[PDB]
Design a protein around this ligand. Sequence first.
Ligand SMILES: *[C@@H]1O[C@H](CO)[C@@H](O)[C@H](O)[C@H]1NC(C)=O
Lengths: 108, 172, 172, 173, 53
Amino acid sequence: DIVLTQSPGSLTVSLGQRATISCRASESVDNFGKSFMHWYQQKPGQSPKLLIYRASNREGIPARFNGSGSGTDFALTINPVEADDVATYFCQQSNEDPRTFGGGTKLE
Amino acid sequence: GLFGAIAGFIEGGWQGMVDGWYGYHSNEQGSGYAADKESTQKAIDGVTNKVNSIIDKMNTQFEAVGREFNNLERRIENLNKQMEDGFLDVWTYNAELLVLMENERTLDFHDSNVKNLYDKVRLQLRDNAKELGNGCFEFYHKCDNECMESVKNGTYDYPQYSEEARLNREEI
Amino acid sequence: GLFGAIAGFIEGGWQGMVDGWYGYHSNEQGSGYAADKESTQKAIDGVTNKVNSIIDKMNTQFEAVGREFNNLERRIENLNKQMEDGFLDVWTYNAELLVLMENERTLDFHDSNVKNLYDKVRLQLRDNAKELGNGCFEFYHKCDNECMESVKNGTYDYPQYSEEARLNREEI
Amino acid sequence: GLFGAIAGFIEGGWQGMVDGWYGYHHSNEQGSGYAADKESTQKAIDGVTNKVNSIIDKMNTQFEAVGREFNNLERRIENLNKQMEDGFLDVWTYNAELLVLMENERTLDFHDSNVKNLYDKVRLQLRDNAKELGNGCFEFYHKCDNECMESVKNGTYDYPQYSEEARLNREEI
Amino acid sequence: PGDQICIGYHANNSTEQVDTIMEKNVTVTHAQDILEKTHNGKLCDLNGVPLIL
Ligand SMILES: *[C@@H]1O[C@H](CO)[C@@H](O)[C@H](O)[C@H]1NC(C)=O
């Protein structure tokens, strides 16, 4: 199992600023030269949504979302933060079964 | 083959020698097969480098690319096809021929390693042994296991056995 | 050549042997030439397969096609020309080189067949004959026509003549 | 090598022989010294020189790249043209590299063969008039003065002239 | 009657054949195949990344 640990657990950021959510993998999630990390957005009261695939590229997703990172640690950067960004954000790896997700980070 | 040894003056290989390609005895202490580690390793290195060299020389080979053309580009379509087939045919020839040529040299290479091994022993034994003419030398003296080992590792002391050999030649 | 036989230790070929490439006698019953059918047929098969293999490897060669272009297609006209000449030059090199390389191997192949034939006889005769050093072995015993035939077909009974040979060596 | 002579039964070359590739070292009462076999050396020189000249000759009809320009809507033939140029450049680079590798190997074995032939040239002359030491050297069963040494070197050894004194020296042994 | 030593070479139960200029189908003790002839008959993802129209 590749344990994924997101940090911080809850993040409150001022409107129009920068949210910076981190992910840390127990072992690397990074071969073939690409990172097999994914970011997901769960706006409250509905199913999760796909933001970033293989750690850097956006899926109809605004540029405000910066997927970054390589290897063992990554980061979803939301900047500028808008109103409709309240959600819990999840990182999940596909590098190696069993597919594992992060704890998740709630944004306020 | 080219050098007259493999399937030549040595008519047949030994199922019995299994720890190598080329090798060697029969005395009072008993008989048995043994591989010449040195000549075997040399051949292994040579063939392995050969195989690796063939695969290496082919890394800059042609790689076909998908290209599309319309009904009024039939000429360059055909040119493009001839170009692709052109290189595919060249490189297929190059791979096929290289394999055929180096195969032939490889078989003769083994033949040569064997003929050299036979000569290595022959040039040591000289008149201290008789050439049976089948890859075997019949000794004119007593060759114990340690003596057998000296012939096999190129440290035969010819003059040590010279006298007892000469005496045994002359009652014959 | 590579193997020291043809135009080597055997200095010259025989206009007299006409039924083959390689062959052999002179006794009391009389002298004459004879071809070694076996080694000759082997060489014929080898060279014939070689010739047929060379012609075979060339069936997927480039074939130039007429193509026309106008005054504003000078670039692809030239590209097309370079492509055609390009392959024509490659395949001309391939044919010329292949012929040069296999010619050299063929001459050395014959040299090797001869040197092997000489060794075939030598390894049979051993001390029952003297190496004159010109491709000829002078016998230490009487070799009638049937004996000559046994040397030629690899059935020489060395020990049968061993004693009369040994006796003739020692008054010398 | 292929023929067992160079770095084979003759284990090592001579820094001392400098006037040629292959030759002799003699040793008699008049004294010792190195000498090159002019004939076999010249043959090899001619062979290798023709080989080098043949390799350079076979390459005169090689591909020569030409500058050609294309615009933004000619990307296809631009690429075709590039593939064609690289295509031939890669073929001819293979041809030059391989030819050199193959003929190098044959050249080393060619020298090996010239040596083994030279040794055999002497051996077939001396026969039982000398003993094969097995290291490229023949120990004579008779007296070989400088003129005799010269006859072995130029292929005019008179075997029967020394036959008797050789045979007598073999038999007290 | 006398002690002897023999020079010889390996042989086995191999049926692998190989080709040369002068001879075809030469049974040999060891050979290496260098031509891949099988595929999975499927279109697949390439190193964790296709657009199928
Ligand atoms: C080589 O063997 C194969 C089958 O094992 C067969 O396709 C063919 O007839 C053979 N050809 C020759 C020339 O031996």
